[PDB]
């Protein structure tokens, strides 16, 4: 199957060309909305933290995959292990608000406290890159914030960006995979 | 905002995606 390569028009041959028989697939697992729909730890440093998805680790499935797109939209779900009252505030709110309790404040019920929050930016969509503040989902504050996780719901992605693996030392990257106990 | 090792809120934040919190 010769093509004019310069064209940039997609080409996909099949085993049929030599006599094989292309089968079926179920790429459920490689579905955007689906893969990103899970929790990811985000490194919190203070007892108050602005919610931002770019803070997921760049090599973590979610963050790696989110960064594999340039523009994105989604709602949020959060799981915080905290102490005292947890207060959330919407994108663009004066930071001073975090102290006020009439804002969505959740009392303690350990271990974690789970919430569903609406996309709250003022743009039609947000970005992974940018060639020039508002790119957030609001902020959270609790007397103590031991741990923080976020989950992207309803995810939409636009324009793909690259996504690299590990550069192997030798011919392939060998390593220890889950195996049964030797006995 | 150019590339950059800085922080959003800092006088250099207008160059940070790098860390102007990526995106304004």
């Amino acid at each position, epitope marked *: 199957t010769t093509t004019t390569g310069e064209s940039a028009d997609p080409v996909t041959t099949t085993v049929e060309n030599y006599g094989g028989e292309t089968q079926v697939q179920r790429r459920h697992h490689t579905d955007v909305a689906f893969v990103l729909d899970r929790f990811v730890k985000v490194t919190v*440093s*203070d007892n108050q933290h602005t919610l931002d998805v770019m803070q997921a680790h760049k090599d973590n499935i979610v963050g790696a995959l989110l960064r594999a797109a340039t523009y994105y939209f989604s709602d949020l779900e959060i799981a915080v292990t905290h102490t005292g009252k947890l207060t959330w505030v919407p994108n663009g709110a004066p930071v001073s608000a975090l102290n006020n309790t009439t804002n969505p404040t959740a009392y303690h019920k350990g271990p974690v406290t789970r919430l569903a929050l609406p996309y709250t930016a003022p743009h039609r969509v947000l970005a992974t890159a940018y060639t020039g503040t508002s790119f957030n989902f609001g902020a959270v504050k609790a007397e103590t914030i031991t741990e923080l996780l976020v989950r992207m719901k309803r995810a939409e992605l636009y324009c793909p960006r690259p996504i690299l693996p590990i550069q192997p030392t030798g011919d392939r990257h060998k390593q220890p995979l889950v195996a049964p106990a030797k006995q | 905002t150019t590339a*950059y*090792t*800085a*922080s959003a*809120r*800092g*006088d*250099l934040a*207008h*160059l940070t995606t790098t*860390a102007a919190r990526t995106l304004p």
Partner: antibody, heavy 120, light 112 residues
Framework: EVMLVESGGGLVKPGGSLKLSCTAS????????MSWVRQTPEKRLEWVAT????????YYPDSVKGRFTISRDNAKNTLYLQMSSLRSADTAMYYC?????????????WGQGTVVTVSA | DIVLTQSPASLAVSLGQRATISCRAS??????????MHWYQQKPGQPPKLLIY???NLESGIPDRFSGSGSRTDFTLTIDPVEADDVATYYC?????????FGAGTKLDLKR
């Protein structure tokens, strides 16, 4: 080589005005962010203002907002700090600092100074 | 405003000894994966001289007798060994967050 010589110091009465210049040499000025820091009599150092990258996004501490203006002239490589309503607290030795290079890395390369003496 | 508090404010130290200088910020000075803490040397009549610039890394070629460490709030200059070409007032300063605060200095002098 890199070179920041400031000019414009003086004795001024309260409420008065001066404009300093930081004349620059030995680097591409038009593509670097610039600062003024002062040093008070009792030898403590206050930042004064920062102008962005050969264009403008200007930044100030509270004591000086309203009274002091940082401006730059990329055409003839001179930074300015116009100062109105000189409060006697403003008697300091003023330095032109190159603020930015690849990153945020301190204030390396500091000018030499001009003193302002606000006194009646 | 973040406030920095240097300790001691003047120390006398014998030549070849070790002088350490702590600088506490009232609230974190790290942003991103960077402490934005800077250390300067002011000899009488000199402009300040940048010495250390993100808490640990030295500038240009100032002597390796000079080092810094510190994360968040607690930062230290270490001069080990002190030579007489070090008498001066030392300052730490932060660049994480406007208004770019500056510590009080510590005047190092020589125990003779």
């Amino acid at each position: 080589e890199v070179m920041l010589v400031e000019s414009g110091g003086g004795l001024v009465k309260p409420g008065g005005s001066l404009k300093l210049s930081c004349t620059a040499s030995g680097f591409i000025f038009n593509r670097c962010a610039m600062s003024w820091v002062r040093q008070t009599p009792e030898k403590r150092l206050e930042w004064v203002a920062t102008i962005s990258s050969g264009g403008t996004y200007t930044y100030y501490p509270d004591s000086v907002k309203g009274r002091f203006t940082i401006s730059r002239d990329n055409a003839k490589n001179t930074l300015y700090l116009q100062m109105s309503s000189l409060r006697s607290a403003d008697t300091a030795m003023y330095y032109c600092v190159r603020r930015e290079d690849g990153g945020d890395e301190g204030f390396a390369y500091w000018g030499q100074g001009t003193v302002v003496t606000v006194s009646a | 405003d973040i406030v920095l508090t240097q300790s001691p404010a003047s120390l006398a130290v014998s030549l070849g000894q070790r002088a350490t200088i702590s600088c506490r910020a009232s609230e974190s000075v790290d942003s991103s994966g960077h402490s934005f803490m800077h250390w300067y040397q002011q000899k009488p009549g000199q402009p300040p001289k940048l010495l250390i610039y993100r808490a640990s890394n030295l500038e240009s070629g100032i002597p390796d007798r000079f080092s810094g460490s510190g994360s968040r709030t607690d930062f230290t200059l270490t001069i080990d060994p002190v030579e007489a070409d070090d008498v001066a007032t030392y300052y730490c300063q932060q660049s994480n967050e406007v208004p770019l605060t500056f510590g009080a200095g510590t005047k190092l002098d020589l125990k003779r």
